[PDB]
TrEMBL record:
Lineage: unclassified sequences, metagenomes, organismal metagenomes
Residue span, POTRA domain: 160-236
Keywords: Cell outer membrane, Membrane, Signal, Transmembrane, Transmembrane beta strand
Assembly and binders: Interacts with TamB to form the translocation and assembly module (TAM).
Stated family: Belongs to the TamA family.
Cellular component GO terms, alphabetical: cell outer membrane; TAM protein secretion complex
Protein name: Translocation and assembly module subunit TamA
Coiled coil: none
Compartments where found: Cell outer membrane
Parent-protein residues present: 23 to 282 of 577
Amino acid sequence: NVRLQVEGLSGQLEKNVRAQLSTIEPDRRFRARVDDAIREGLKALGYYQPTIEFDLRPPPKKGRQVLIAKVTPGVPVLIGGTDVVLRGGARTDKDYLKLLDTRPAIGTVLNQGDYENFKKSLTSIALRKGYFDSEFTKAQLGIALGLHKAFWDIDYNSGERYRFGHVTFEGSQIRDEYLQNLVPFKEGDEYESKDLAELNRRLSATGWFNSVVVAPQFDKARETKVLPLTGVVSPRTEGYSTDVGPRV
């Protein structure tokens, strides 16, 4: 029942380590696993060559057995260059241009998560806006430890923005003309993921169905850039005398 203690660390570094530590659950094998863990925490934050000296304290009177680890981060890797190219609709797209500005400046300390996040952001704007052919020609976080420098190389192609095709409904007790009135976009409008959510919600506001499943048809779209939707719905169906005769 062992306690890890880290001395020598401060700030964000301290936290990224401590976190990386509670990760594990007292011999040389276990100590090495601790050394590894501390090293992962520092790399992510730009420290590839630290020093870790362990002091293992004897199983105490009673209570909890301390393993200290005294850490000197050392010299950090700095961003020495970014080469990010955006091709396809992303080249001029307001949100891809916005993201391009969050690249780190030459000279700042390497943070791997900035790089991980950045790539995840491009994929996320692509999915929200229908750039379904989105691909990276290159995507490399390179570390030249000779130079203490890190380089981003990203060559990213959004491709063209797909367009909404026709919505076909099936199972419905409501006639098509009326479903078609509810679709929040015109055929040939540029895709936007939030219009799928708004289609779902408009459908629900009518009370007509108790189930809808809206499936984009990708198999076609791949080569026309027009995405038909299929909406499979299941309908929801749940004082005076009848014995009044007619006017005689």
